[PDB]
Design goal:
The PDB classes it as virus/immune system. Keywords: virus-immune system complex, EV71, antibody, E18, neutralizing, pathogen. The entry is titled "Cryo-EM reconstruction of empty enterovirus 71 in complex with a neutralizing antibody E18". Chains A, D, G: VP3. This is part of a larger assembly, with three copies of chain A, two copies of chain B and two copies of chain C. Chain A is mainly beta. Chain A has one domain: Jelly Rolls. Chain A contains three helices and 14 strands. In chain A, the strands form three sheets. In chain A, strands 3, 4, 7, 10 and 13 form a five-stranded antiparallel beta sheet that branches. In chain A, strands 5-12-8-9 form a four-stranded antiparallel beta sheet, with no helix packed on it. Chain B is mainly β. Helix content of chain B is 7%, strand content 36%. Chain B contains three helices and twelve strands; from the N terminus they run E-E-E-E-E-H-H-E-E-H-E-E-E-E-E. In chain B, the strands form three sheets. A five-stranded mixed beta sheet of chain B has the order 3-10-6-12-4. Chain B has a five-stranded antiparallel beta sheet with strand order 8-5-11-7-9. Chain B is globular, with a radius of gyration of 19 Å. Chain C has a single domain, classed as Jelly Rolls (Sandwich), CATH 2.60.120.20. The radius of gyration of chain C is 20 Å and the shape is globular. Classes of the chains: A mainly beta, B mainly beta, C mainly beta. Strand 1 of chain D pairs parallel with strand 6 of chain F, so a sheet runs across the interface.
Chain lengths: 242, 244, 225, 242, 244, 225, 49
């Protein structure tokens, strides 16, 4: 026969190897493919769809799970009080875990690109107010007050007919890609911090609720990309599935 | 753009606080191609008598409501001429124009998430412990026009997060902004036609993400009404009327 | 930066465990030298969670069968794998007449040969497989006793996979066959929320109601990391 | 030699694999092929040839087997009496098992297309009558009376010079293909029911027989197709064939 | 189309209640090609003296008849000049025009299936139990012109269903419609020529599928006559006359 | 919808069991280390019923020989398969001179090697094989004693298939050789009614006259399912 | 190496198989063929004598 010489790797079964395999059914023809709505071509299509960000990931009670989906805002004392805070890191344990983006990230080792968070005010029509959403790039410790938070990337949000506002977390990194940030050494890939402050105050007339809620929705921008597939950190199974 | 009118059949809907219109998956309802079809009998396309707006029951939004859902081919199977055709024919096919309406005042507040979830399969709490393989009753999987209330909205009673329900054709009703949501859904299934009785192509979910609130004195009764109209309805495989 | 590694083929075209068959010498689990595995890739969490990200999926696949003893030892034994499409006669013993495979596709391999690998087409009568079927397979009254059928779609039931010792006497060694699947030429429609809770059973999304854990990690206060 | 790497499936013997095999006789040349009448190119050619449908599959007696090939019709009381009934399912146990179509179906898992049943009246020239052959699509229970059967696909047959009439069972399915229907879950693929009723009555003069028979012949239409080969449900052998 | 005339040789057949003509497998009888042949001797093509209508015995159709059959090269081997050539020559080849005739009245009824079954091999009941390997006698495998009666028509005395016998060139004689069947058969065999004595290319089956019936008073004797004519007859390999 | 899977090649080009040869150590069935199998695919019901759907058939074929012990165990043994066309000398022993195969085609394989496979042409002196021959092979009187020859066509008798242990001493193991056949380049003529009753013998269509079963299933009344 | 899969018939020695075989003498050149009377091309030439 034709002189050959097998090399290392012979007989191995590489999970991700893309080769040819003998077909079990000769001349078999699959059922025609009808037209079906909502076909997906690339996962990045899903990373751009906003899903609810659990900024208020505090309640763990059985009856209080639905309230992690929104955080409160109310009449204050007028000293630029802090409202909420959270890390901007997508593939890190925290608020982003409730989003589709955060979930898809779990399947990739690295990501790159700008992120965006849209805040929707669900108070009453008579309620007014201005907030200051700030994004603090790496190195900046959690701003102690508004006067410190406003020194970074931010946006002053005015409640009105347009219920929502979008905070764009621009891609400000030293490296082209970021691996998932965790506590310790990998905190090198942290994205930064987001913090909502009262620019002025939540004002309301007599007869209207003194407390309203905000719902945060998060997704990725058009320049967002991911690479190097891996398995999500969690496996939803304890014993064999029956 | 805030005002709109939806006319189909002999019914017209009006609104002055809308938020555009969503066309599920960027596709308008259409009839079945001659190459996508299999059933050889000529279908019935009743048009105006079935493709019109049907207004189902009204729900009351309370400061403690969890949310409701309606399975779609189903909600209409016992109403008007659409229902008759759905009962007399084996095969059914159609898209829908769903219009959820709920108005309040400039002093009320709250936000409803109105979404369409295809193949909305319901699960059970499995006896609480999770060791009992129980299943949802017929009354819950196909609630009819009265809809059904969610017991655990956070997981949509199916073990999936509602926070991601926005990857589905949806719209919100934020009382300070709009008083209705309009979603147009094309026929979605892996088959060109299917039974309107055994199968429910999708489910309509109306869930309060931001609780309703107002001061004592403002009208406390805030209804949520569901109006829907079939589109491009086609039926085939005629026989006697079957209820289920 | 390339967007190629996030295409459906890049994501799904990676072989993963979907089946595991035991052929022990003594026991109560296939002790007669043969086994019938119901083709269902829903028995393992990793592979299952990925595919359940979409509602419908159309694809060809590449099945690889890794066989050996429970210690991982490679033994000089000849096996026969047979694909039994629904309707074909499932073997009732090691010497069943069904092993004649006059029409069913079969593979004969020794455990000393590299794992058998084979290509499978999209064989559903539907235009795609459904990881979720919100309905019943048959008409009639749907009583408590038959709720077992809810969510069961025959368009996903591709048949059985049978294994045996090619012989008429008991094998000298205990065997195990691990089945791996690699998807090719993938089309997918309608994405869904990713599995949140532990899996318990194959034919359904049941979850432990007393152990409903949050999607992720938690902390002390909302104002502190 | 040339570096190679054998993959899984090596050495396996797949019954349906279509490969090359070493020829046993080098330079052998087969006997020329003469022209022979009746050459078959596709099995569908046979599915279109009508064969006797055993609608009267009741007699099992040794001497009464030949009477399953035809069913009786006779003078009635004039109330649209039922004549005969049978499932339209081709690959299901019943009347269709006597037909070539039903037999070829046994070799395929799925089929699609319209079917046709031709009824030939073998009464006397002086016998007259009108029948109503009805086809009830899926879901419709066996019609209790003619007034119910006539609501489905049907044809009123008038006996005359043209002895036969053809009932076309149009392809009315939800799925593109149907797998063989059996009792239970697979009854999902049922085609429906056929039922013959007296439209008027079997009328005859004095001197002519009061009972005549009808012979049903069944086959497939031009749009009939089958796919996914399998073995017939039955194996005509008990012990080794000597 | 209901009337017809078949003229061949010095014989003519007439009919006023025919049902068209069937040409087996869509092919007319023809002579052997120069490339399909092997025998090198020049054949005899007697034409008019052998290609004509021969009328064999008549059978009586009774209300209880089971059916009959005739093996073909055979039925003619002892008749006319065709028989002489079939006996003197080793090799024979030819097609046939078979005309089965049976008339009644507008008050009689019944239906005969007239079919051609190539290579009609006869089997036995195997001693009833099926343990005895018995074989059909010469008198039954090659019955001659008198034909032979079927003992188990349902299985054609060969373990095959008569209900499928229609995949063969056939025609029916439905007394209320026609009074004859005409089938034209080409030469069918895996050889260009063969012995007219040892081999029977096909068999003619006449079987009552719908029993004959009539009221007492109408003539009770209803005959079934078989007329047949060879076509494109060729013989070769001359020697002395051999009977079998 | 494609009509490709119902062509003759799609239907018949699937290997099926047609022969089975035993080479035991002790017994009354080929105990001398060799066997002569008369080439006839009419010994097994599945394959036989399919081909008997047609009267005449012309085709090339692919024969595969699967060998092992009665337990399915693969043993280090060398065998010799030899095709003995009609007229050639059939081996009378394991050491027969006929095993020299100076002209007959032979195959030498070990049971440890993958099953031997080989291509065969259409070798009939007729233009096609006949599953049915309504006649006798010779002239003369056809008495009771010779009715054994009715329906026997020599144009279908292709010869013998011989097997042996390549040696001069008894083999250390009991063997079995299963023969599979796959038809290629198929032409077929004149369809017939499909086998209705159980098969009893090879050279004929005999059926058990006391156990004549209906073609199919039966029911109580014609007016009830 | 290049993925292959040996089929039945492997290692068998078919008497009439017409294949290639390794040459024992590299670059060997046979004695020229002179012209010889009575050369036969086909056995049928003899069947006619």
């Amino acid at each position: 026969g034709f002189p050959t010489e097998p090399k290392p790797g012979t007989n191995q079964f590489l999970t991700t190897d893309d080769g040819v395999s003998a077909p079990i059914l000769p001349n078999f023809h699959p059922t025609p493919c009808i037209h079906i709505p909502g076909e997906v071509r690339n996962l990045l299509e899903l990373c751009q769809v906003e899903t609810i960000l659990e900024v208020n990931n505090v309640p763990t009670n059985a009856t209080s799970l639905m309230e992690r989906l929104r955080f409160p805002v109310s009449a204050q004392a007028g000293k630029g009080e802090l409202c909420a805070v959270f890390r901007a890191d997508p593939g890190r344990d925290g608020p982003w875990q409730s989003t589709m983006l955060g979930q898809l990230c779990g399947y990739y080792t690295q990501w790159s690109g700008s992120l965006e968070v849209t805040f929707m005010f669900t108070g009453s029509f008579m309620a007014t107010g201005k907030m200051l959403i700030a994004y603090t790039p790496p190195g900046g410790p959690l701003p102690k007050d508004r006067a410190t938070a406003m020194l970074g990337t931010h946006v002053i949000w005015d409640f009105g007919l347009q219920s929502s506002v979008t905070l764009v977390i621009p891609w400000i990194s030293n490296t082209h890609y970021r691996a998932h940030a965790r506590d310790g050494v990998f905190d090198y890939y942290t994205t930064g911090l987001v913090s909502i402050w009262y620019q002025t105050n939540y004002v309301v007339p007599i007869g209207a609720p003194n407390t309203a809620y905000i719902i945060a929705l998060a997704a990725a921008q058009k320049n967002f990309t991911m690479k190097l597939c891996k398995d999500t950190s969690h496996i939803l199974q304890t014993a064999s599935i029956q | 753009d805030r005002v709109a009118q939806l006319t189909i059949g002999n019914s017209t809907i009006t609104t002055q606080e809308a938020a555009n219109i969503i066309v599920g998956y960027g596709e308008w309802p259409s009839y079945c191609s001659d190459d996508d079809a299999t059933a050889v009998d000529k279908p019935t396309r009743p048009d105006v008598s079935v493709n019109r707006f049907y207004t189902l029951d009204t729900k009351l939004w309370e400061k403690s409501s969890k949310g409701w859902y309606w399975k779609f081919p189903d909600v209409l199977t016992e109403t008007g001429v659409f229902g008759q055709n759905a009962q007399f024919h084996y095969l059914y096919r159609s898209g829908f124009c769903i219009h959820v309406q709920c108005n309040a005042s400039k002093f009320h507040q709250g936000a409803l998430l109105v979404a369409i979830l295809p193949e909305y399969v319901i699960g059970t709490v499995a006896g609480g412990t999770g060791t009992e393989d129980s299943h949802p009753p017929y009354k819950q999987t196909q609630p009819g026009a009265d809809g059904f209330e969610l017991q655990h909205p956070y997981v949509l009673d199916a073990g999936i997060p509602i926070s991601q329900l926005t990857v589905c054709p949806h719209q919100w009703i934020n009382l300070r902004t709009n008083n209705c949501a309009t979603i147009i859904v094309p026929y979605m299934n892996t088959l060109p036609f299917d039974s309107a009785l055994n199968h429910c192509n999708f489910g309509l979910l109306v869930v309060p993400i931001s609780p309703l609130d107002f001061d004592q004195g403002a009208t406390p009764v805030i209804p949520i009404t569901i109006t829907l109209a079939p589109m491009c309805s086609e039926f085939a495989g005629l026989r006697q009327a079957v209820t289920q | 930066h390339s967007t190629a590694e996030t295409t459906l083929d890049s994501f799904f075209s990676r072989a993963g465990l979907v089946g595991e068959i035991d052929l022990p010498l003594e026991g109560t689990t296939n002790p007669n030298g043969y086994a019938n595995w119901d083709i269902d890739i829903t028995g393992y969490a990793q592979m299952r969670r990925k595919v359940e990200l979409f509602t419908y999926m159309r694809f060809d696949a590449e099945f690889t069968f890794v066989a050996c003893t429970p210690t991982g030892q490679v033994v000089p034994q000849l096996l026969q794998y047979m694909f039994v499409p629904p309707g074909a006669p499932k073997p009732e013993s090691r010497e069943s007449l069904a092993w004649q495979t006059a029409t069913n596709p079969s593979v004969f391999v020794k455990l000393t040969d590299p794992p058998a690998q084979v290509s499978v087409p999209f064989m559903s009568p539907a235009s795609a497989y459904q990881w979720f079927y919100d309905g019943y397979p048959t008409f009639g009254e749907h009583k408590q006793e038959k709720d077992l059928e809810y969510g069961a779609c025959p368009n996903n039931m591709m048949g059985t996979f049978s294994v045996r010792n090619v012989g008429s006497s008991k094998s000298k060694y205990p065997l195990v066959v691990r089945i791996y699947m690699r998807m090719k030429h993938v089309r997918a429609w309608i994405p869904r929320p990713m599995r949140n809770q532990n899996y318990l059973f194959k034919a359904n999304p049941n979850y432990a109601g007393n152990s409903i854990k949050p999607t992720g990690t938690s902390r002390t206060a909302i104002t502190t990391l």
